[PDB]
């Protein structure tokens, strides 16, 4: 198994929240309107601040967060900001309840995978080691040689290992014949291994932050295809196994025991919580008791929904009572036209497309009429249409034509009805 690994984050899901840098709260935990990327929504932000302060004080005793609000509100952005306020490089795994319904994968296994995506691992290890072929005790590399002055202690600790002049060796500071003598008549099996190249000394600082899932996919190969063509390689993802994950966990705990790495539970955000059934909530309930579990943040845009897995047992947001008990519900409000104009201005300055104030107004009225998401979508097409004229500055006519070329869901549906 390998230590240093790469990590492919699903940045397709945070593309509309690049402007969100935090919650924008004062020292007294009071939300500042138009600050740190957020515009208004002071109540929800302050509540999230209370949540973060609760997690930091370990007072969040097996509890989660529930974001209740309309499609126009910013639940996802709030979850992201929560992850951002919990520290630096804090894991954030956003999903929807519709994702657990996989074809040939059980729901709680998808949940398990995303939990692995929500549990991070911070590695900060100043590793110092002098390697090379022994010549005295001194060492030699491809280009470079050193003469180390060893105390009798290290030399009596050398008496243990298979050390003789001149083999290739390794030295731990804080805590095997060489290739040069290999003949053509030896072949394999051999005890010959190449001389450390090309530095006689090797003192590096290992700094990394990777999720458990990153370790899972890193040790799923014996080229990186799973990250290259994930779903498109084969119907069933038969690479990530139980034995694999258990070996990974064993290795991780081993790293922790040496005080090398510290795992950090991030934020698991689940949209469309009403889509989950009883068994999923059983799994989540089991997760909430775990001390090394990521904070769970559900979200919903439904007042009352039938509890899936129950005999038409309608309930709050489609959440079972036994699990709703352990949740702090935070309401998210719709936006005034001015707040929408502000948000649109922040987005278009981030995309970043240049547009008139009147265009901002025309977009904002769609932000009020239809959801905020649609009007935010209208940006790029209008930019393209304007650039077609070479205007390079998006105007009202552009947004108009864009809104007429790309309708929303309800408009399309009701027009199609006629």
């Amino acid at each position: 198994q390998i230590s240093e690994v790469r990590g492919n984050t699903r940045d397709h899901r945070t593309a509309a929240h690049t402007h969100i840098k935090g919650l924008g709260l004062n020292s007294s935990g009071i939300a500042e309107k138009q600050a740190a990327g957020f515009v208004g929504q002071c109540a929800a932000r302050e509540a999230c601040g209370v949540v973060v302060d609760l997690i930091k004080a370990h007072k969040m005793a097996g509890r989660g967060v529930l974001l209740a609000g309309g499609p126009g509100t910013g639940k996802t952005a709030l979850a992201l900001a929560i992850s951002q306020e919990l520290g630096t490089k804090i894991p954030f795994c956003p999903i929807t309840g519709s994702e657990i319904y996989s074809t040939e994968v059980k729901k709680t296994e998808v949940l398990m995978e995303n939990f692995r995506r929500a549990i991070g691992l911070r590695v900060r290890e100043t590793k110092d080691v002098y390697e090379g072929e022994v010549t005295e005790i001194g060492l030699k590399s491809a280009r470079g040689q050193k003469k180390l002055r060893l105390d009798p202690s290290i030399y009596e600790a050398i008496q243990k290992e298979r050390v003789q002049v001149g083999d290739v060796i390794y030295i731990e500071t804080n805590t095997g014949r060489s290739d040069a003598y290999a003949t053509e008549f030896d072949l394999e099996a051999e005890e010959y291994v190449p001389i450390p190249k090309g530095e006689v000394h090797k003192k590096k600082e290992i700094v990394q932050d990777v999720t458990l899932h990153d370790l899972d996919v890193a040790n799923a190969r014996p080229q990186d295809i799973i990250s290259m063509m994930g779903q498109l390689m084969k119907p069933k993802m038969t690479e990530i196994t139980d034995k694999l994950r258990m070996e990974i966990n064993k290795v991780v705990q081993k790293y922790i025991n040496q005080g090398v790495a510290e795992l950090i539970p991030g934020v698991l955000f689940i949209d469309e919580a009403h889509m989950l059934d009883i068994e999923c909530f059983t799994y989540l309930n089991k997760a909430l008791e775990s001390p090394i579990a990521p904070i769970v943040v559900l979200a919903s845009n439904r007042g009352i929904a039938t509890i899936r897995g129950a005999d038409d047992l309608k309930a709050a947001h489609g959440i079972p009572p036994d699990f709703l008990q352990r949740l702090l519900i935070i309401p998210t409000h719709p936006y005034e036209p001015d707040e929408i104009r502000r948000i649109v201005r922040i987005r278009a300055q981030t995309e970043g497309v240049q547009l008139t104030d009147a265009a901002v107004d025309r977009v904002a009225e769609h932000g009020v009429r239809i959801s905020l998401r649609y009007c935010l979508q209208l940006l790029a097409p209008a930019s393209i249409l304007a650039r077609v004229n070479g205007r390079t500055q998006v105007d009202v006519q552009d947004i108009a034509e864009a809104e007429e070329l790309f309708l929303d869901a309800r408009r399309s549906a009701n027009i199609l009805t006629s």
Binding site: K250, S300, D322, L328
Partner: protein
């Protein structure tokens, strides 16, 4: 090491019994110290008297009542009336359904958590006066002869903090099971500091639930077991081994079987098959006391197309003893909330407590309890000397309750402004 039976989540750290007169079986309010519900508590005491050399003949106990009422608290009280070192396992009904394990398996584990095996074996127990205790994201204890500093993980810290142990307490710690016992106090029961060796080997009584015995004699669940594909069911071979050895021990006389209490909350979530299992279990002599709780008046019998009170089969209903709980008067609410507050280390202003009592009236006890800690944190961010009414109001306007939640979400499509609209 291993683990003894208590090990009894526990958000009810204020219950030592039913608050009931030993002879009269008469409930004294706010004793032991659970408040009110005198009728249901007395009924529970009567049931328990009907268990001791009982005419009850293996019946289940159904506690039904409105949410935010001490049916669970009363269940734990009944668990304490049998005394400590007696298995007590709680369980939401909806927990029975998962991918990790089958219904039969989950029910089996749940029942085997409620039946303890009690033996007499030697162990290295410690007995001494506590000097220091620390916190992290270590225990210092001395005797009249020596002083020592030990290390401990999450389980041990939980166990000691559950026993309300601080600096100055004379305690006993089993280094084999992790069973902590508070003997007394050396200053402000007044005991003197123990002498001689700190760690002594005594022949003590060890009770351990069947499920725990199964876990011990199984491959220890790896780190991050929940977040790996690894399930939680126990191999039949191991179970058979344990059952056989326990049977041999009972024949010999080495082990004595001690039944306990299994508590199933929102029991209306169970289907017919579950009740079949529970009924079949109640026939065995080793069966524990099965106490179920219900928040619903009439529910659908899951598995069939018939409806019944609390969602139980009629056959099952004819074999259960029903105890009913009632809404609390404002006084009882205030008292309960205050007890719950002093155990969360939250210093409240009288006005904040009263307001929290009203919140408890309108939304429920669980919600108010949830608001306590948030109020504490809001007061902390304020550098407030105490948690006043302002903090409670702020947390109330920040964290909504289910009613206001669904109301707020439904507010996206309002129904009237000048007239009803639909």
């Amino acid at each position: 090491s291993v683990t003894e039976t208590k090990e009894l989540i526990a958000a009810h750290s204020h219950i030592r019994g039913l608050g009931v007169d030993a002879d009269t079986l008469e409930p004294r309010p706010s004793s032991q110290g659970l408040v009110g519900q005198e009728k249901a508590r007395k009924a529970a005491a009567v049931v328990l008297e009907m268990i001791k050399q009982g005419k009850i003949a293996g019946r289940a106990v159904l506690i039904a009542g409105p949410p935010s009422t001490g049916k669970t608290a009363i269940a734990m009280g009944m668990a304490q009336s049998l005394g400590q070192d007696v298995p007590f396992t709680t369980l939401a009904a909806s927990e029975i359904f998962s991918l990790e394990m089958s219904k039969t398996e989950a029910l089996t584990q749940a029942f085997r958590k409620s039946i303890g095996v009690r033996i007499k074996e030697e162990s290295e127990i410690m007995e001494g006066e506590v000097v220091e205790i620390q916190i992290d994201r270590k225990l210092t204890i001395k005797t009249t002869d020596m002083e020592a500093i030990y290390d401990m993980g999450s389980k041990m810290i939980d166990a000691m903090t559950k026993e309300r142990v601080m600096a100055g307490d004379i305690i006993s710690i089993d280094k084999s099971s992790g069973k902590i016992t508070k003997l007394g106090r050396s200053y402000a029961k007044f005991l003197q500091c123990p002498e001689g060796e700190l760690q002594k080997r005594k022949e003590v009584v060890h009770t351990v639930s069947l499920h725990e015995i199964d876990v011990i004699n199984s491959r220890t669940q790896g780190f991050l077991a929940l977040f790996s594909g690894d399930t939680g069911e126990i191999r039949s071979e191991i179970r058979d081994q344990i059952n056989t050895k326990v049977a041999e021990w009972k024949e010999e006389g080495k082990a004595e079987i001690v039944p306990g209490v299994l508590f199933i909350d929102e029991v209306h979530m169970l289907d017919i098959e579950c009740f079949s299992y529970i009924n079949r279990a109640l026939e065995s002599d080793l069966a524990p006391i099965v106490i179920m709780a219900s928040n619903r008046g009439v529910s659908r019998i899951r598995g069939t197309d018939y409806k019944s009170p609390h969602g139980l089969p009629l056959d099952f209903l004819d074999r259960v003893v029903i105890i009913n709980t009632h809404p609390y008067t404002p006084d009882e609410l205030r008292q309960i909330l205050s007890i719950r507050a002093q155990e969360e280390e939250v210093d409240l202003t009288p006005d904040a407590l009263a307001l929290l009592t009203k919140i408890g009236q309108e939304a429920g006890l669980r919600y108010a309890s949830n608001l306590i800690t948030t109020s504490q944190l809001i007061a902390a961010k304020r550098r407030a000397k105490q948690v006043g009414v302002e903090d409670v109001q702020r947390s109330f306007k920040l964290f909504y309750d289910p009613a206001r939640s669904v109301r707020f979400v439904q507010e996206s499509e309002k129904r009237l402004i000048g007239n009803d609209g639909v």
